[PDB]
Design a protein around this ligand. Structure first.
Ligand SMILES: Cc1ncc(C[n+]2c([C-](O)CCC(=O)O)sc(CCOP(=O)(O)OP(=O)(O)O)c2C)c(N)n1
Ligand SMILES: Cc1ncc(C[n+]2c([C-](O)CCC(=O)O)sc(CCOP(=O)(O)OP(=O)(O)O)c2C)c(N)n1
Ligand SMILES: O=C(O)c1cc(O)c2ccccc2c1O
Ligand SMILES: O=C(O)c1cc(O)c2ccccc2c1O
Ligand SMILES: O=C(O)CCC(=O)C(=O)O
Ligand SMILES: [Cl-]
Ligand SMILES: [Mg+2]
Ligand SMILES: [Mg+2]
Lengths: 530, 538, 532
């Protein structure tokens, strides 16, 4: 067995032993040792392989596969710009804390500078965005040292996995794992074994990261939970303004529109609040003390008056019953204003589409939102997220790869369900037309590749500085033709067919035509009803 | 406002420096120098191109720079911009393209607490990173600040065009911001850089049986024009004695003159690696390539003694004829249409004055296998890193700049044609480069020929294309996708037609929309057999 | 001036964050926070230390941090400062030292037209810039809050307050050429104590040996196990295992604490594919020799008990090893570095701080079987450089003294043991102006064998390299150590090895030089191996 083949199979085996169940693969000659090894691991059921053409959107497919089931996901590609194309997904994975392993092939470092074709400054390309950039090193031709090389290769692989999952740091994130490979790259015309019982070479258990923080709940308190927030049972009774991706620890919801009309004496901040301007405006009021509770070492700088950080609260006291009544009444008032104006508005807007999707969902659903207006609109409509997994690329809230993220979240979620009978759970994506068109090529799944069992992509189509001149005109891109180009079933429907159509039992796109013209008066009328 | 003066001063100097096109994207915040650029665009002093896709925008800038050799600016607006600009910036570094990346950092705002998202590649790819510094409000010091700003902008331009280094490439230019003073007379740049020559003569004796291999970035060498030359399509041809790359292993050169950076043909890299063959590397810039460390000397031009043997010149010319005949005759006998057939058809239908944009993978090779005579043609390809990413926007930008050059010549004549030949994978990779708003510049004579064999044909020709891998190679190297290319063009309102290879020539001979896609369905399951028959007919 | 307000706020918050010492050098431009730092030093709120040599100033800051565990700042002022601070910053990263590097970039000036290197990207826990101070008194409260939280962020990353991985941080406060903090002196953003918990199941009935290196944690439930401890490694119990006993025993499993760097037998054991090695660390990083770590955690969950036979054999081989070193030392006719180390170990009392140079000194102190219980031991094991050790000793003594005097009695002793090459490397650290703080009970003991003794013990020390190894590895210098201490007005004395104990029992800063021999070092160590 030649060295490139041997090294690639040890690495793939250790990655599977480390809990990698899905791998995204992109084509190239230099990464042939990785592709062959990943191929026959897929053939023997060890992993699910996903081949894509476009490295950039492929990274967001890997992200989707990671957030959909919570497991580390590798994306493998060849040397050169194929590695650079992972930049966008790496930036998002860094801020969203996603265990994304960029498993790049390379030519031997000894050829960098020689002018060799398709060779670049690959190691360190991502700089500070990854948790680590680890090079495996060139596989030596030395049979007598096969047991030594097997130990170093496997140990390096667990380092990559641990950095990516935050096994010891509590801060998952992208890792660059660069594999210099040289010919022969294809199997020549047994692989060094790992630990017994399928154990990882270096076992590191998930650490428990604890920083208790004393907080008095008697002071009038509002909880604001953003992306990456944890669950806090002792904060469940408090009024909570929760982003759609934040897990609702309790059942005392507070609409984001209600918060500006309330006067909290202190704020408990869960995770990283990324979305609401009213949230930011209260946090930028330096005079209300903010307590930062996070699941990892990072904590948000959004308030300048963050008195303290921690992982959990040690609560004394109890919220004033009058305070709870007031906020609860303001929450119902805010959500009544939204629903009544929506019903009085004559035209279907993106908020109507968003409200319609939120009503269609049921516990067990997975909802994927494009990171601009859809996550805002769903939040405005007052989506009750208890019992449903909401996913969104809120690390940088970029537009790239949204379709691919939804396809990946569906696949990992469904596959988690077929490791337990009943019909696979529903994944419903809500993305706007510009984002859909922008990552429309993320729809492309090869005829030989896994197709989501139950993904429905709802496109809320409202047909849309001198750089902003390109929004001065509707693009008028034919959504149906786009889905035809990537052979995906599509149907243009109306907002009240949405509920029934979603209840109609593989992967499909439902396009709902929406008006953007009157959106200002819809929102103005909602501000007035408060 | 000091910042607003500063932007007009910089933009004026960028225009005086030869920048004719700037590419912007919508983003988190305002573009660097956006209002100054808008003023210049409205005045016709500069042409702006807006895209939503930051990755395709970077390669659009590549095309706008290589189509006519001008420095090109790209304006960053976002927190994914650096990431999306990465691939094109690396290509600009390796292909020596004058790409100016503009930023507007905010020195009054916090940093490191969570807009610039630095990666690691800027410190390895750019010729320079220059920051103007915040614009002081000091009306008294106006003449001095003007001089400082225009001097720095000239320094940015010189780094990008290689004015003093002969190594063009990407430059990071930052104009900081907190949220017109004249230049030189007669539109001359503030700091002038006259022609520079780097001269490294090498003594080479041409009586030794010599072959010339010219790759990307190769210079023109009149004293090597007689020698047998194995030229890449982007290599400018000095002379008259083409040597087909497939005739190379049927000859025994005693010495090789290497021009520029070759990246094509395994027989080229074998011969370049042959310890017994002296290899002389002639480049136009400070870098020089090697295969296996087998380069004996490196220079910029040759000082030649002697002449090649007649029998050696005849023998190469005969083997050249055999290779071309094997290709034409085996192609004719082949039952299915392949990408090599499409490339042969495109080559025949090319006229002088045309610009040819070649995608990576098989198209740039197949065009060489078809014996295309590139003289009179301007051939572009991203040989820098040989990506299949960004090729649609490279062809579009190259056609815009090449047509802009021609419209600027004042000639009352239809603009020259830009013909692109790319694979199906390459097309899908940069499909979103086809989305151009009506507000933006669109080519007037761009045709993109898409050779569609529903996957990556080049791998049928590699070791993983051997029949012993038939079971597994289809999925992980072939990567079929079944994309309806016609519908994809339909979606972006791009004229397209699906034709057979024999109709390709006449279709190219008749004009249509300014931007159009010609799709030729092709087969790759017989590609390995076809190439096998060519070698056996050699 | 908004910038002056900014600098004062930052210094005030750095004070509340436990920074008691700041190190400065004079430079082309004026130092960052220089005026605010001056007022703090005049008020006794902080203590300034000024040096000319920027490289020794970096290691002085390292010493001021490891001496009492406090965050220390260094004030960059020049175009050579980043280059000169490089060594210290790399050491601060690997040894996990809370070092804050202050910078003051000028955003109104051109950059890139004619002083960074490549190491800041790979070494620092964080790089944070404050941004220019806006002239807006309307928002004075909001700016005060923003500046103070950032400083807390810088302090948090430097001390490992949330990562459990202290290290160097780059803190930039730009400028162009006092609002209150929290009540009761509390930090603006308070980070309570953090635990990272990674329990490992360890069966102690299996013949187990403990190897503790730099940064090792304390483990009560492992106190009884035979423990091969490094000098800087805190001791959990009282069952020491000499490093020389290890190659004669056959442990069935190894518990590895912190980061070992010493002893070739330790590496062979940890690299043994048939011995499971469990790595217990206090931070996220973990070490491996030849990729032979079975698991990593922060603490052990123990089942079973070591076999009495196994304990007794290890303890027996400990006495065999230690007695063999002591006996071969007394039989040796010449004073060597090992002799000087043993003399120093015998002279140490609880409450002392012992600072150890690299090369033989830090190895010899273990071979001499120093009992480190009750003694703080410092060595720059992060990169094991022989650079900067004098100012590392000085800064550790200043900080250790400072901590004791914020409690009566005479300040505790700080005793340093360094080879001659180490001493000459950082000789400029002895240059201290009469305006600067000077330690009160610091004794630097230079074991001078006129070259690198450690290279006598390696492959290049074989007699077949007699002809060539003396120049390229021995590197003798013939330096007059006494004249060098005289030049800097440092108290010096050249004494024999049996004067060491008494002389250390008697000036605030003094050097004791003990002339030593490396000509016979290889034969001496051979005699110990022989008698083992
Ligand atoms: C972004 C990116 N990602 C992956 C690669 C690797 N790659 C190539 C390479 O081998 C190119 C080598 C050369 O010198 O041209 S060539 C290739 C297949 C391209 O298929 P295609 O566009 O349909 O062309 P075809 O006619 O099928 O050869 C792939 C996937 C790449 N070059 N760029
Ligand atoms: C700045 C620098 N430059 C070179 C080295 C290499 N080096 C060392 C090494 O071998 C280090 C080994 C260890 O783990 O301590 S040890 C060493 C000799 C030190 O001589 P010394 O101070 O007189 O010690 P001695 O007691 O004579 O062994 C040298 C030259 C270094 N460590 N740092
Ligand atoms: O809590 C989280 O998950 C989280 C994640 C992040 O990526 C952050 C980035 C900067 C600042 C705070 C962050 C944060 O609190
Ligand atoms: O000749 C050229 O244009 C050229 C361009 C490059 O990007 C090179 C990179 C490495 C080594 C040689 C190179 C080279 O010779
Ligand atoms: O596919 C090819 O032939 C070129 C790609 C290459 O050289 C590589 O393996 O990196
Ligand atoms: Cl021959
Ligand atoms: Mg193809
Ligand atoms: Mg010595």
């Amino acid at each position: 067995m030649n060295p490139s083949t041997t090294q690639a199979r040890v690495v793939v085996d250790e990655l599977i032993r480390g809990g990698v169940r899905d791998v995204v693969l992109c084509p190239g000659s230099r990464n042939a040792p990785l592709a062959f090894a990943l191929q026959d691991a897929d053939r023997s059921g060890r992993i699910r392989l996903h081949v894509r053409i476009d490295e950039r959107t492929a990274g967001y497919l890997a992200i989707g596969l990671a957030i959909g089931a919570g497991a580390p996901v590798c994306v493998a590609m060849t040397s050169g710009t194929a590695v650079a194309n992972l930049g966008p997904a790496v930036v998002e994975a860094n801020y969203a804390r996603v265990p994304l392993i960029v498993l790049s092939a390379n030519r031997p470092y000894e050829l960098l500078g020689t002018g060799a074709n398709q060779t670049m400054e690959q190691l360190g390309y991502f700089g500070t965005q990854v948790r680590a950039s680890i090079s495996l090193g060139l596989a030596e031709d030395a049979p007598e040292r096969t047991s030594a090389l097997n130990a170093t290769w496997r140990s390096a692989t667990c380092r990559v996995l641990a950095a990516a999952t935050g096994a010891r740091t509590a801060n998952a994130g992208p890792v660059h794992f660069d594999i210099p490979l040289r010919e022969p790259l294809v199997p020549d015309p047994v692989t060094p074994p790992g630990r017994p019982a399928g154990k990882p070479w270096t076992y590191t258990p998930p650490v428990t990261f604890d920083q208790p923080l004393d907080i008095d709940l008697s002071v009038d308190t509002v909880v604001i939970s953003g992306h990456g927030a944890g669950v806090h049972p002792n904060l469940a009774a408090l009024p909570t303004v929760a982003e759609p991706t934040a897990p609702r620890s309790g059942d005392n919801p507070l609409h984001p529109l209600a918060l500006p009309l309330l006067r909290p004496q202190q704020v408990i901040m869960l995770g990283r609040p990324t979305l609401h301007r009213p949230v930011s405006v209260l946090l930028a009021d330096a005079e209300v003390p903010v307590f930062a509770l996070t699941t990892g070492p990072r904590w948000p700088d959004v308030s300048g008056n963050s008195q303290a950080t921690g992982t959990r609260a040690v609560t004394t006291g109890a919220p004033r019953p009058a305070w709870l009544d007031r906020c609860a009444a303001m929450n119902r008032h805010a959500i009544a204003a939204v629903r009544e104006q929506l019903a009085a508005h004559p035209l279907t807007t993106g908020l109507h589409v968003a409200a319609a999707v939120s009503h269609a969902l049921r516990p067990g659903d997975q909802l994927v939102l494009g990171a601009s207006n859809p996550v805002r609109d769903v939040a405005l409509a007052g989506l009750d997220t208890r019992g449903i997994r909401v996913r969104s690329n809120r690390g940088v809230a970029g537009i790239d790869g949204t379709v691919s993220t939804a396809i990946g979240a569906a696949l990992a979620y469904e596959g988690a369900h077929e490791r337990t009978p009943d019909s696979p759970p529903r994944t419903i994506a809500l993305i706007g037309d510009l984002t859909f068109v922008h990552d429309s090529s993320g729809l492309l799944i090869g005829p030989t590749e896994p197709i989501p069992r139950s993904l429905t992509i709802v496109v809320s189509n409202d047909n849309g500085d001198v750089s902003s001149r390109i929004f001065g005109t509707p693009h008028d891109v034919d959504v149906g033709a786009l889905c035809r180009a990537y052979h995906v079933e599509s149907r243009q429907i109306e907002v009240d067919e949405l509920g029934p159509t979603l209840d109609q039992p593989g992967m499909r796109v439902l396009e709902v035509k929406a008006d953007r013209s009157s959106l200002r008066q819809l929102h103005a009328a909602i501000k007035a009803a408060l």
